[PDB]
Design a protein around this ligand. Structure first.
Ligand SMILES: *[C@@H]1O[C@H](CO)[C@@H](O)[C@H](O)[C@H]1NC(C)=O
Ligand SMILES: *[C@@H]1O[C@H](CO)[C@@H](O)[C@H](O)[C@H]1NC(C)=O
Lengths: 231, 221, 221
């Protein structure tokens, strides 16, 4: 069928936890093949390698090419443009992308286990909610004590758009299931959220047994010398 | 392109609420068609009036109506289709699922960091541990059901265990702080196949997250 | 005394569990010739099937038929008609029924357990109360935790009419007794109420061991 061309921003985990930041420019809907080429406006090292094509719906050619080393121009607010010409269309196509403006930072919340899970004494679950952030890219990582847990032990959903009270914002959730003996020893668990709009690119919250559905509040205030010639 | 057919279970929103439960046998082809179910059941099917998709095969489908009871009784349905552009007549079949499990529903109180801004408070509903992945989530305020455009539910993913295969889902609802202060109640209902009464409900209000007792001691010495 | 004809309405249990529906049209009063054939105004393919002439006392052998498949036109608001022909009645008569209108949503309350029997520590009584619904049809079931109890552990009264301002509503009650051991431990219980004026066909209220907060403030000099 008829072709199309798009442009994709770099992935979030490589801009936060990494060094390299590859853009990409793809070309789908091509009939058989091409000996095509691309165009990038900053080209101080633009080894735009292509690689092999893939096979798409019913039979289609889909080839693409990436551009390495573009982290600090992306963070400074620059602009990138891709444009390709090929046999199987009349005119060259074009596309552009830029770093987003007018963003918001998330509100992170970590919730204690429900009351009826603590009685059966087998496993408990903790919930991590992030809310109200403007681009839809986000990461979630869990810790036990001060050591990171492996990725295959929890479940994270996707970022979706919430009902509107003004500006459009997003939200995401996650749950982690831990042993009910570690909750009663006094171990602490922590939830980390990384986003484009946060100051140092990560923030965290922490919870344990004494903080959350506490059923007891103990506080003792001692004031030593209230009548004591304050100079 | 390529020819391919499938069957589809009836939708849960009509198996649970009001019994008009259809059963659809679709097919992608014409690179006139027939269908035949193994229960004849008197009332014949309809042939789909043949939308095409994605520059490819002009797809046609068929719908057998009235399958609310024998789906629940445990029968088997098969659909066999035929087209001139096919070598042999194709087939598939579908039944009701075995070894099901019922979900555990929890409604969580809002976080303490949020009530100090006087804007809106958020409530969180969680359903966990059910084996067939079809489920419904609805919210209420008192007795009035809220419209669908007022809240947000996610998809029903598969949770990481090793015993068997179970699933989970979440949902949030943001209500006004003045209604939370006034003492109104909000509910979360969940519909599933494996529940004996098809629904279960949890309720919450501004109390019952409040602590049991507080001990303060000031020592002026 | 006269051989009378009547018409019923479908039972709320299977109408709310969704799988089928019935509608029965009765003639009794005299043991006559069993030429009792019955005429229904609509027929959704499968017509009426009369059973046996079911026996009764002192010659009052009844004759009555029932057609199946009356979920969708009954819920939409159709108007059904029944008439019979058996030789004693030479001039039979019309029987029209209709889904009721102007319904009210009920109010359900669960009351905690009087401390007079809580002092004795043998058993406690829980009371579920419904009030303010327009037709005289309910379903009351009890649960514990997330498991449903069998129907022989509790009793339930019938639906009386309350006298109040202007219009006519109704009320039901029931009573459950449970061991004080796990109730002291903290096991939770719940009461469900089924009605056709509710949007999702059910409501549910739970209860658990309403206490306020204790506050201890001490100053030491
Ligand atoms: C980016 O592309 C859009 C077309 O989607 C165009 O309207 C806009 O002017 C372009 N901006 C730049 C800076 O090229
Ligand atoms: C029916 O479906 C089962 C699996 O769902 C399949 O193994 C079988 O071949 C099908 N056909 C029959 C029983 O004719």
């Amino acid at each position: 069928c008829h072709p199309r061309l798009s442009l994709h921003r770099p992935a979030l985990e490589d801009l936060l936890l990494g060094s390299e930041a590859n853009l990409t420019c793809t070309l789908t809907g091509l009939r058989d093949a091409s000996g095509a080429t691309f165009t990038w406006t900053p080209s101080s090292g633009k080894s735009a390698v292509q690689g092999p094509p893939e096979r798409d719906l019913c039979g289609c050619y889909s080839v693409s090419s990436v551009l390495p080393g573009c982290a600090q121009p992306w963070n400074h607010g620059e602009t990138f443009t891709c444009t390709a010409a090929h046999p199987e269309l009349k005119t060259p196509l074009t596309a552009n992308i830029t770093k987003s403006g007018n963003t918001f930072r998330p509100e992170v919340h970590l919730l204690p286990p429900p009351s009826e899970e603590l009685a059966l004494n087998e496993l408990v679950t903790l919930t991590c909610l992030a809310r109200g952030f403007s681009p839809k890219d986000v990461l979630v990582r869990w810790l036990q004590g001060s050591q990171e847990l492996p990725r295959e032990k929890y479940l994270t959903w996707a970022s979706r758009q919430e009902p509107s009270q003004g500006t459009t914002t997003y939200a995401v959730t996650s749950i982690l299931r831990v042993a009910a003996e570690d909750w009663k020893k006094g171990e602490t668990f922590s939830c980390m959220v990384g986003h484009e709009a946060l100051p140092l690119a990560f923030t965290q919250k922490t919870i344990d047994r004494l903080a959350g559905k506490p059923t007891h509040i103990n506080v003792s205030v001692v004031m030593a010398e209230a009548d004591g010639t304050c100079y």
